[PDB]
């Protein structure tokens, strides 16, 4: 098979700056027609692949002219000038010279933006859940940068541990920030036993840690 190497695996680029990424083939992609049989695709998060460039240099119908390509023989380059938040995703090259057609392993575009502190929100468990015997307490860190953050749970001032997990979004398609959810799971009995539920957030955008808390029953 023809092998396509995409190096590096991840490149960071600042909003509004240009970037170049590489696809190198194990053999020449020159077809007898005089076309080089290489394509570029963008896969945004949760989406199908989207064609950007055909045959090295040709802009696909409906694609921004911020995207261009060049190269010959074995080394090809996609260029994105004035990178926008919407360009976040993974770029894949594909060769059509020989069957089987083959993809490169893909280059993730990381978008650099300014530091941003999280907005922090805490949610008690729903009365509907409590009837089922389980209590889930949720802590939301909204629209922050960079990705690193620490969430500690405390119940009546007792530092919790072992009884929580979290999820982080990929970089936002509009503003290139992250958001993070942390869920504390306890048993109806435990939750009914204790008063003060607190989420303590540490992030480099904050001059000191932020705590959001509620007292059970006190609405």
């Amino acid at each position: 098979d023809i092998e396509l190497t995409q190096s590096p695996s991840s490149v960071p680029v600042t909003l509004g700056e240009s970037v170049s990424i590489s696809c190198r083939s194990s053999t020449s992609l020159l077809h007898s027609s005089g076309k080089h049989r290489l394509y570029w695709f963008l896969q945004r998060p949760g989406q199908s692949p989207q064609l950007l460039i055909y045959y090295v240099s040709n802009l696909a119908s409906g694609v921004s002219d911020r995207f261009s390509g060049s190269g010959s023989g074995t080394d090809f380059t996609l260029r994105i000038s004035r990178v926008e938040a919407g360009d976040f995703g993974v770029y894949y090259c594909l060769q059509s010279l020989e069957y089987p057609f083959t993809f490169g392993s893909g280059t993730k575009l990381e978008i650099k933006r300014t530091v941003a502190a999280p907005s922090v929100f805490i949610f008690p468990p729903s009365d509907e859940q409590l009837k089922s015997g389980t209590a889930s307490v949720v802590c939301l860190l909204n629209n922050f940068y960079p990705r690193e953050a620490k969430v500690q749970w405390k119940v009546d001032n007792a530092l919790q541990s072992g009884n929580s997990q979290e999820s982080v979004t990929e970089q936002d398609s509009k503003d290139s920030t992250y958001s993070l959810s942390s869920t504390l799971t306890l048993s109806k009995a435990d939750y009914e036993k204790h008063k003060v539920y607190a989420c303590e957030v540490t992030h480099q955008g904050l001059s000191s840690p932020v705590t959001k808390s509620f007292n059970r029953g006190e609405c």
């Binding site: 119908s61 594909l94 993809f103 889930s136 999820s167």
Partner: protein
């Protein structure tokens, strides 16, 4: 107006077979080559093969010969991918895409999620994350298997400020996620907020109103 519509998510047993569909509308599938692409969770795109819809002839990546069979029904406007002797390596999203001489790779389906498992499906429990300038509210989508779930807000009328989190596994071997949205605090007494949660493997669809807390 031209579209490829792929079949729903499937939970299938190890050793069994599955057949995925890719339906053309707004064009005649016989005028196109149909490509199938695999993507295992968190991995890259893998070319499976492609069928000439006018002739039925297929090219395959030999890594899949004896597991993958691409076919086309010219009359019904549908292409298919059949996978046999399923293993956990076949858990993935499968995309279909067309190619023509004038437009190249200009059209893809939204992908079909296939999960190969001995385990039975579980549908989600949906709970409100009730709101406290800007307010946050949401829905907790708890204890389902397999992926994926879909979440919308107000039947898709509300897109701005929504964040639907990646699923995480619990120690139970079941997935959980949350979807949140930030809204003007002034809308809390006026505007209704409903999360719409669908899970095809469990034949689950739920709508949960999220409204200010209590007292």
């Amino acid at each position: 107006e031209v579209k490829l519509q792929q079949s729903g998510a499937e939970l299938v047993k190890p050793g069994a077979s599955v057949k995925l569909s890719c339906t053309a509308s707004g064009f005649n599938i016989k005028d196109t080559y149909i490509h199938w692409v695999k993507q295992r969770p968190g991995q890259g795109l893998e070319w499976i093969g492609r069928i000439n819809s006018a002739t039925g002839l297929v090219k395959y990546d030999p890594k899949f010969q004896g597991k993958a069979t691409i076919t086309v029904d010219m009359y019904s406007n549908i292409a298919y991918l059949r996978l046999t002797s399923l293993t956990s390596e076949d858990t993935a999203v499968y995309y279909c895409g067309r190619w023509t001489f004038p437009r190249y790779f200009d059209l893809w389906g939204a992908g079909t999620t296939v999960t190969v498992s001995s385990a039975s499906t579980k549908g989600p429990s949906v709970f409100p994350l009730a709101p406290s300038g800007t307010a946050a509210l949401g829905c907790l989508v708890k204890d389902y298997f397999p992926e994926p779930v879909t979440v919308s807000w107000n039947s898709g009328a509300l897109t701005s400020g929504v964040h639907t989190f990646p699923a995480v596994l619990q120690s139970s071997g079941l997935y959980s996620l949350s979807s949140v949205v930030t809204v003007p605090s002034s809308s809390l007494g006026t505007q209704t907020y409903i999360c719409n949660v669908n899970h095809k493997p469990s034949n689950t669809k739920v709508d949960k109103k999220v409204e200010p807390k209590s007292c």
